[model samples]
Target: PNAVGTFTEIPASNIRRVIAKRLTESKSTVPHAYATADCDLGAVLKVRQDLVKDDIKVSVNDFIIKAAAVTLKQMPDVNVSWDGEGPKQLPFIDISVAVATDKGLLTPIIKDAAAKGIQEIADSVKALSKKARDGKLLPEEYQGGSFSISNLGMFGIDEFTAVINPPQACILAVGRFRPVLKLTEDEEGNAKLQQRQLITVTMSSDSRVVDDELATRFLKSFKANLENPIRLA
Candidate 1:
C-alpha cells in the first residue's frame, strides 16, 4: 500500500455528530411531506434598492425572517409541534434561523420575531450569527423555536428541500433567485422578452401535525408576504 498519499482523513466534530443524530431522529420519527412554490423576488429586491438611499443595508435573509414570522402569525395551524402525540401550538413566534459555522450548523433563534420590526430582526440576525460562528451562543439562544427557516441562496443553490427540524412541524427551505425570461405583449401588442427573478421555496412538514392542505396554504401565505415586500413590516 502506498502510504504517502496527499489528503488526510478528517474526524467528525461533536457538533456534527449531534447534527447527524438529531436529523436522523427527525427523519425517522416524522413523515416528511414537502410543498414547493415559486415566489417573485422583484418586489423585495426593489425595496432593498430603495433602502440603500437611506443608508440602511439589509440583506434578503432579513426580509425572509420578517415575512416568515408574520406569516406564521397569520397561519397558526402550521406552527404546531408533534412529539408522537397531539400537536401543540405555541403563542409566541420564535424562529430558528440556521447559520453555518466553522464548527457545524447552528440555529440561533430570534425570539418573538412576530413582534419585532425589520431593523430589529436584521440586527438580531447579524448579532446571533456572529455569536453562533464565534461559539458564544447560550442554550436558550439556540433552543426552543416554533419554526425554522434555512436559506441556501447565498451559495448559488437553485432549488433544494431541507429536513424538518423536529419536534417543530415545518421548516422553510429557501432556494436561489434565478432570472426567468418570458414573452409579454406590450403597448404595441407585440411579444417582448421580459425577465424577472424568482425564488423557489420549499416547506417540509410533518404530516402528523400539518395536513397537505394546511401546508400548501401556509406556503402560499408565506409566498404572499415574500412577493409583496411592503407587508413584511
Candidate 2:
C-alpha cells in the first residue's frame, strides 16, 4: 500500500527528477552562499551535564536549541525569509528541528523559542520527540520556522551538511561532539590537559537575503553564547 495515498503517490524516479529540477532552478535563479564554523562544545557539555538531574533532565540538544534561539535574538538578520520580491525579517526566534523516524526525515517547529526558558524548552523538546517517535505531530508542529537545525550527533557522525529549507535563509548542520587532544602550557611551564570537542556547523544562506558579514556575525555570536550560556540567559 502507498503510504501517502495512491492518488498522490510518486515514483522514486519522479522524485529524483523533481529534485533535479528544483536544484537547477534554485542554483540558476537564486544566488547561494555558505558559511561554516568549527565551534567549541566544551562549556556546553559541562552545562548539559550539570542541568541533568532526577527532577529536570536536560539534554545537550536542548542546550543547542537554546543557543540557536539566543543567537537568533541577538542577530535577527539570520532569522529572515526570502520571498520572490525581497527578504523579510521575522519577529520571533522560531526553529525547526529535524527528527528521524522509520518513514523518513521530519522537522518539527518550536515557535517563539527565544521567549521561553531553557527548562521549558527542554520539556517542549521532550514532548515533540515523543510525538515524532509516535508519528503524531500536526501540520503546524512541523512547519513555519525561521531557522532549521539538523543534528547527527547520536549517529556518531563526525561531520555533515544540510540543504537550506525553503523560505528560511539558512539551516544549521550539527555534528557529533568528540573529545580531542589539545596542547596548552600552565603557569609552571608544564603541559596541561584539556578536553575539547569539534562541533562543525554549516549555514546555507540565500545570497539574496543574507550577506557574508551578517551570517558570520550571527555564527560568532552563537559561538560566544554557547561558550557562556549563563550570560545569554
Candidate 3:
C-alpha cells in the first residue's frame, strides 16, 4: 500500500539561498577540523549572578564572546582567512554571533570586540539580536568578521558542531551549562560528592587557515578566560 501524506514544497528565500551557498562553500572548499573542551563555569556564573544584584545582566554567550575576543587578540594567528594569494591575518577582533530568527540564522558582527567590555558586548548583542529578529539589520551589521560563535545553550542542546562561516578561521559551538557531580577527597581523604557547573564548547576550524596548534592555543586561552572571567573583564 502507498503511504498517505500531504507534502508541501516551500520555496527558499534569498536569505536561505545565501546561507546555503555559504554552507556549500565552507564544506567543499575548506578543510574542517573540530576540537571540544569542557569549561568549569563556577566563577563565570558567579560573576553573572553577582552582576544581577546591580541590575546589570549578562548572558553566558556574552562572556563567550568576550573570551573569544581576548583569545583572538592573544593568538592573532588564528584570526586569519585564506584567500587564493595567501593567509590574511585580521587586525581587529570582530566576532559574529549567530542568532536564529524566523527567516533563518543570522550572524551579526560585534565590531572590535577585543576592546569592548563584557557589558558593552552584552548590549551590542542585545541590540543586534533584536534587529536580526525584526529583519532590520543593516548590511554592515551582518557582514565580515574574524570569528563566529553559535550558542544553543538556551535551547537545551548539550553539544553540537557548527559550520565555519566563510573567510573566518573558526566558529565556536556552545552547549548548555549543567551541574555534574564530582567525587573529591577531603582533608581526611574521605570521598565526597560535589556539584560543578560545566559547559562544553567545540571549535570548528578551517585547517587551511588555522592549524591544529593554533586552534589548540586559541581554545586554551578561551578556556582560561572563561574559567577566570577576570581576564575577560
Candidate 4:
C-alpha cells in the first residue's frame, strides 16, 4: 500500500518544534468537547458593507472577535482557565487570534477586547497580524489569553474543530460564509426566494473546566451576538 514515490525529511524548526510540543501536551492533557452553530450573517454583512462606504473597513473576523468578547462578558464563567487548583475565572476578556506566518502559527492577544469597539478590534488585530507575519511579536503579545479564535474563513474552509489551547478553557474555529437559498413569505403573504449569508462556527471547550451545558450556553450567546451584530458596532 505504498505509492512509487520518495520523500525528503525536513526537520521542524525551533518554532515548529515548540508548537508541536505544546499541541501534543494540550491534546493529551485537556478533555475537549465541541459545539457548533450556524449564524445568519445578513445583518453583520450589511453593517460591514455600510462601514466600508465610510472608508472604515472592518473584516468579519473583527466582528467575530468583538462578538466573542461580548459573549464572554455576558457569561463570565466561560472566560476561565484551569489553574490545576481549580477553574480560575478571568477578569478581563483577552482573546488570542490565530495568525499563520512563515515562522509558525502565532496567537496574538487582544487585551480587554470586550471593552473595545469593532473598529478598534479590527485595527488591533491587523497590527498583531502584521507583527506576527514579520516575526516581531513580543512574549507579552502572544503569550497568555483567556480564549482563542482561529479563523480559516479567508482560506475558504467550511468548518473545522480547533484544539483547546492549554490554560485557556476554549477556542473558537470560524468557517467561511456562504449563501443559501430559501423560500419565504413576503409581507403580503406571497412566496419568494431569498438568499441569505450563513457562517458555521465551532467551539472547542475543555470539559474539565466547562460542561456541556455551559459550552452550549456560551455558543448560544455567541450565536445571538453574531446574528445581531449591531451590538458589536
Candidate 5:
C-alpha cells in the first residue's frame, strides 16, 4: 500500500530540462571506465596557508582545478572525444565546474584554464558560480568545455563517481579531505608516525575515449601537481 501524505510538486525549469536531456544522453551513450586516486594532502594544505598569508585568496579547490588543466594539457590522448565517428581533439582547454543552483546543477566554464593562473581559477569559480546561481549565465559561460570537475567535498562525502557531460570524455569527482595516521621515516633513519591529510578523486571516463593506462597517467599527473608546491615536502 502507498502512503497518502500530501506532497509538493517540483516544477521543471528550462535549465532542469536541459540537464535532464544532457545527462540522459550521456548515461546511455557513454560507457564509463572509473579510476580513483588518493592523494597526500599535507603539502598542498601547507602551500595554501602560504598563499593565503601572501594575500592570494585561493582555496584547495582552485589548486586542483589548475592541476586538472596541467594534466589535460600534458596528456592529449585523454582529452579527446568519441573515436566512434571520428576522434575530436580539442584545440584549447576549458574546464567546466559543477555548481548546484535553485533550478538545477549548472556548469560554468573556466575559459582557457590550461593557461590561467591559480588565483584566476579561484576567482573564476567564485564569479561564474554566482552568475549560475542567479540564472544570469551566458551561453559561452556554460559551453564548449573539454573537461569537467564536480566536488562534493564541501558536503563531506568521502567518495563517489560522476557521470560525464556531453561531448567531454572525462569528468573528475572530488571528495572530502580528512586527517589520517601514517608510518613515517625521519632524517638519520628514525621511524615515526605522522598525521597526514588525504583526499580521493575518482575519474569517470568514456571507455572508448580513455583507456585504463591513460586514465592512470592523468591521475598521476594531477597528483604530482598537487604535491609540487614549494617547500611543502
Candidate 6:
C-alpha cells in the first residue's frame, strides 16, 4: 500500500481565544495614523531598462530601499524610536523590508542599508525572502530596524497609508507606478500625449518624533532622490 499521512488541526475554540487576547493587547496599546502621496517613476523605469541589458537587473523595490536609505541618512531624526521621555535617534540606518507570505507579513532587517550599494541591497532582499519563506529566520533577522519599507506596487495598488510600527518612528508605504497621459504642445502648437510613470510613497510617522513640516521636507528629499538616483549613489 502507498504511504498515507493524516493531519490534525487546532481546535477553533482555542485558536479564537488566543487570537482575541493578542489582538486586544496589540490594538488597545498601540497608536497609529496614516499618510499618503503620489509620485512619478518615469526616471526609475528608464534607469531600469538601461541597466537590464548589462545583466544587472534591479527590482523596483531595490530602488525604493536605496532611496529610502539615502533619505534616512540625510535626515537622521526620522530614523529613530521613541522613549517615554523623547525620541531616541538610532545610530545605524537599519530598514526593515516587509514581505507578505501565505501565513502573514514579515519584516526582515537590512542593517546599515544606507552604507550598501544597490547590488548588495538586492542580494540581501533575495536572501531574506528565501529565509522568511522557509521559516528559518532568526529573531535577530527581524529585529533592530530603525525604519521600514512596505511596498504594494506589484499589486497595482496606487496609494494607501500604513500604521506606524512601534519603536520605529516611521513606515513608508510604496504603491504602483502607472503611466499618466498628459497633453503637451510644441512650438508649432501641435499637441501630443506624453506618458509619465507616477508612483506614490507615504510615510506614517510618530507625532512625538516628527512634525508635519519636517516630514514634508523629508518627503521632498526622498522624491528628489528617487527622481535622480545618481545623486543618491
Clashes of each: 0, 0, 0, 0, 0, 1
Error of 4 at 213 (Å): 1.4
TM-score of each: 0.89, 0.83, 0.92, 0.91, 0.88, 0.83
What TM-score does prediction 4 earn? 0.91
Clashes of 5: 0
Model 5 residue 224 lDDT? 80
What lDDT, from 0 to 1, does candidate 3 have?
0.83
| lDDT score at residue 172, model 5, on the 0-100 scale | 88
Question: Model-by-model lDDT, in order?
Answer: 0.81, 0.77, 0.83, 0.83, 0.79, 0.77
Tens-digit lDDT string for candidate 6 (2-41):
5766767876676356546754653454455556666667
Worst lDDT run of 10 residues, candidate 2, spans 11-20
Candidate 4 lDDT tens digits, 163-201:
787878899998877676756766676777777778878
Give lDDT tens digits, candidate 5, residues 119-187.
Answer: 777887889877888888988778888888888887867878777887889988988876767766756
Best by TM-score: 3
Error of 4 at 179 (Å): 3.1
From the highest TM-score down, the ranking of the candidates is: 3, 4, 1, 5, 2, 6
Q: How many clashing residue pairs, candidate 1?
A: 0
Candidate 1 stretches with Cα past 4 Å from truth are 1-10, 181-188
How far residue 117's Cα lies from its native spot in candidate 3, in Å, is 1.3
Error of 1 at 102 (Å): 1.4
Candidate number with the higher lDDT (4 or 6): 4
TM-score of 1: 0.89
- What CA RMSD would candidate 1 show? 2.6
